[PDB]
Write a structure and sequence with these properties.
- The structure is a homodimer.
- By secondary structure, chain A is mostly beta strands.
- Chain A folds into four domains: 138 residues, Tick-borne Encephalitis virus Glycoprotein, domain 1 (Sandwich), CATH 2.60.98.10; 78 residues, Viral Envelope Glycoprotein, domain 2 (2-Layer Sandwich), CATH 3.30.67.10; 78 residues, 2-Layer Sandwich (Viral Envelope Glycoprotein, domain 3); 100 residues, Immunoglobulin-like (Sandwich), CATH 2.60.40.
- In chain A, strands 5, 6, 7, 12, 13, 14 and 17 form a seven-stranded antiparallel beta sheet that branches.
- In chain A, a hairpin with a 6-residue loop joins strand 22 and strand 23.
- Chain A starts with 8 loop residues before the first strand and ends with a strand.
- At the A-B interface, helix 2 and strand 19 of A face helix 2 and strand 19 of B.
- Bound molecules: a molecule of 4 linked components (NAG-NAG-BMA-FUL) (2 copies), octyl beta-D-glucopyranoside (BOG) (2 copies) and 2-acetamido-2-deoxy-beta-D-glucopyranose (NAG) (2 copies).
- One octyl beta-D-glucopyranoside (BOG) binds next to strand 4, strand 13 and strand 17 of chain A.
- One octyl beta-D-glucopyranoside (BOG) binds next to strand 4, strand 13 and strand 17 of chain B.
- Chains A, B: This is Envelope protein E.
- Chains A, B: It is a multi-pass membrane protein.
- Chains A, B: Homodimer; in the endoplasmic reticulum and Golgi. Interacts with protein prM. Interacts with non-structural protein 1.
Chain lengths: 394, 394
């Protein structure tokens, strides 16, 4: 009954006769399944975890320059030299500046100069490769028990969590008291994980095209890298200036964090917060129910009377939910329930919370049902003090 | 002699007869002035200071969100409320989320929710208005004294610094021993300081168009602001998400420092380093020299002989500089100097360091001159041991 209240809720039924139904689950979605003489079940995808992906590449988005050093020669004395030209942590550039008596040389002319500065990354983002085969999904299965506190309860302590791995065969789920259900889920698509990259910048994350990702004009490190200091193409976050031929300067280019966010505007978002998976694709599972059975079909219709404990309320999909309490001494018994026409002559609506049964004299029971458009009567209990509640839909 | 060595050096002469010459100075530039019976002078613009300009607007480029709070109502219960909706430091957004039994409401439906978070700027940039009227320029005037250590000496302790303010009348400069010169400088143009804004992001600075600046999609504060917390349009660095109608989130948009740098690529740069003014416009000054006079026109040509102390060297503009020392007993006397043709019959070149005079037996003297293209002889001193140095130009 976890789904009652969610608006992105889908109602699914199987092929008449068969005991297998196919459903699709996406974060933020909810699915209510039904089948002849089978308990109604609610399904919700709680999490999508990718177990250790490959780091295609690592980009620097904010850096710092330090230990600037420089060397220079006089006209006709060749190029200057710095050992830092070999230290892969440093970025360098050669250039010319004016020279002559006033600054040390015997000749006036252009003399070589070389400037180097240590480049240290302060913030970085990673591109990872995800393969469908290894994506674990956590799904919560909550059956329509009618339990006092189950309507829309997200605590998860009414449902049964199951972990599923796409290409790791069938998964078995034991629903206490109802039997056992089976799920065969398919990874295959929503999108292709070969030409796409999962990009992570702290708690934010998107799925982007490989090409686009590989063409980002930022300093980088190969996926395999550990040291995290020998960045390739540091020049992309650096700027060398020698405007008047007097001296050469180097300055960092400033955090690209936002520029990135701005360029990722049109990209598929995965999550903005630590534990708020937004999208993840559509998970398809085939549900087997031959080993699933209704609960209490050994009972007899109660004979006593009921009291409305929580007035009839309509959900965002036209179904109604009501909560009644038994006052009869029948103990474990089936609750009489039917939706009749204005004159109580013919039956018009169906139960979603099929096989409503009391379990304890004082444990109220929730019943979801689908009345017909227009007028109808909700008849609860049997004759002596039988509840006859009128309702109008949509 | 400060200019000897700089490549962006310009040689300027006045209208024959007049004693007024016009020059143009720009950072990274140098100007050598000459005039009949007047000392040759070198001019260099050392600094451009804008005295307390007006802050047109202040933009936030990096922010932080904190103290997130939220309020919500049930379907049909109207809008939620937070006092932070009035606290100008907070950014807020109203929205809907699903409600029903499982999360507190008696009815299932869409209920109002409102979310607020405190927005605190961590880094910002300012746009300032510069008025030509109030721009102070520091200029160093260094005359061609021929002093042993003056060639290309940037120490500034050979020159005379003068501060100039465009529309504050004429400025008087006293050149020790040479008299006094006068400068009348004009602010008027390079560009229109009305439709342009000086933008500063730490030590970096550009001149940009007012419109473009005012249209930057960032959070701002009016120029006059002091508090620095009641940012207008905070929504531009913030993002509210309510993808599944379950709850609403807010996340900062990330430093725009680099994006700004990137958008400022084609803009006019003023400086990248704390004290490295790159550009500043072209400063025009009219130089009056009627009160300026040569030094030592009471002396007689030396009669002794000279020794070359620093061999003839050519500058990047075809002039040559030489340094000689006197061995004669003439004390304060004019140095005989001329550039003759191959046969020493006719005169061909001019002195830049006009009126070369010894001052102390042992103080070497530097002379800059402009020999003719091709062959020529540099004749120094008189007959007995007269220096006859051959030279070839360009
Ligand atoms: C979602 O479910 C939780 C807990 O689920 C269990 O609830 C019990 C009643 C039973 O159905 C079991 O099978 C479910 O898994 C709900 O939290 C529970 O709330 C009730 C009442 O608020 C608590 O019962 C007790 O009531 C007596 C009153 O006589 C008090 O003295 C006790 O202190 C206590 O409140 C019960 O302890 C809670 N159980 C847990 C695990 O916290 C929760 O309300 C529900 N969500 C909604 C909105 O329906
Ligand atoms: C730029 O100029 C500075 C100083 O300018 C002054 O220099 C003196 C000589 C004089 O012309 C005065 O009018 C100038 O304003 C040059 O620095 C000076 O360097 C000299 C020699 O290196 C120093 O002279 C002394 O020499 C005796 C040797 O007998 C030593 O014992 C002394 O310690 C001292 O070195 C003099 O002190 C320096 N003056 C200053 C203010 O530092 C500088 O070299 C020059 N730049 C170039 C490259 O030409
Ligand atoms: C089509 C959507 C792209 C594939 C979705 C898989 C990405 C899962 O998202 C990532 O899962 C990690 C698992 O530990 C978490 O640590 C991260 O917080 C989360 O961003
Ligand atoms: C056409 C170029 C725009 C006008 C140039 C004037 C800007 C000088 O630039 C500013 O001067 C300030 C004065 O204190 C300094 O504090 C700053 O470091 C500097 O950026
Ligand atoms: C950079 O400077 C620091 C402090 O001056 C020094 O300790 C360090 O050795 C320098 N780094 C390198 C590799 O030159
Ligand atoms: C934000 O939270 C801090 C610490 O929890 C608290 O001291 C402060 O009062 C809060 N700020 C506001 C204005 O709500």
């Amino acid at each position: 009954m976890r789904c009652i209240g969610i608006s992105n809720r889908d109602f699914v039924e199987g092929v008449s006769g068969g005991s297998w139904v196919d459903i699709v689950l996406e974060h933020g979605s909810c699915v209510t399944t039904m089948a002849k003489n089978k308990p109604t079940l609610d399904f919700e995808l709680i999490k999508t975890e990718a177990k250790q992906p490959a780091t295609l590449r690592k980009y620097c988005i904010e850096a710092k320059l330090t230990n600037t050093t420089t060397e220079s020669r006089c006209p006709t004395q060749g190029e200057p030299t710095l050992n830092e030209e070999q230290d892969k942590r440093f970025v360098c550039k050669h250039s010319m500046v004016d020279r002559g008596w006033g600054n040390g040389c015997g000749l006036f002319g252009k003399g070589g100069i070389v400037t180097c500065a240590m480049f240290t990354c302060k913030k970085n983002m990673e591109g990872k490769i995800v393969q469908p085969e290894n994506l674990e999904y956590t799904v919560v299965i909550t059956p329509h028990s009618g339990e006092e506190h189950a309507v829309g309860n997200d605590t998860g302590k009414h449902g049964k969590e199951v972990k599923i791995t796409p290409q790791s065969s069938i998964t078995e789920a034991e629903l206490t008291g109802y039997g056992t259900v089976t799920m065969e889920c398919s990874p295959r698509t929503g999108l292709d994980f070969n030409e796409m990259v999962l990009l992570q910048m702290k708690d934010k994350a998107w799925l982007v095209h490989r090409q686009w990702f590989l063409d980002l004009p930022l300093p980088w490190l190969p996926g395999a890298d550990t040291q995290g200091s020998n960045w390739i193409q540091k020049e992309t976050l650096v700027t060398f200036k020698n405007p008047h031929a007097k001296k050469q300067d180097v300055v960092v280019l400033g955090s690209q964090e936002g520029a990135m966010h701005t360029a990722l505007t049109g990209a598929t978002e995965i999550q903005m917060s630590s534990g708020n998976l937004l999208f993840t694709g559509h998970l398809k599972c085939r549900l087997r129910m031959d080993k699933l059975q209704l609960k209490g079909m050994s009972y007899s219709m109660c004979t006593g009377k009921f009291k409305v404990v929580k007035e009839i309320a309509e959900t965002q999909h036209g179904t109604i939910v009501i909560r009644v309490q038994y006052e009869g001494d029948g103990s474990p018994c089936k609750i009489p329930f039917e939706i009749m026409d204005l004159e109580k002559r013919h039956v018009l609506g169906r139960l979603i919370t099929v096989n409503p049964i009391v379990t304890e004299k004082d444990s109220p029971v929730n019943i979801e049902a689908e009345p017909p458009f227009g007028d109808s009567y909700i008849i609860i209990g049997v004759e002596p003090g039988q509840l006859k509640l009128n309702w109008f839909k949509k």
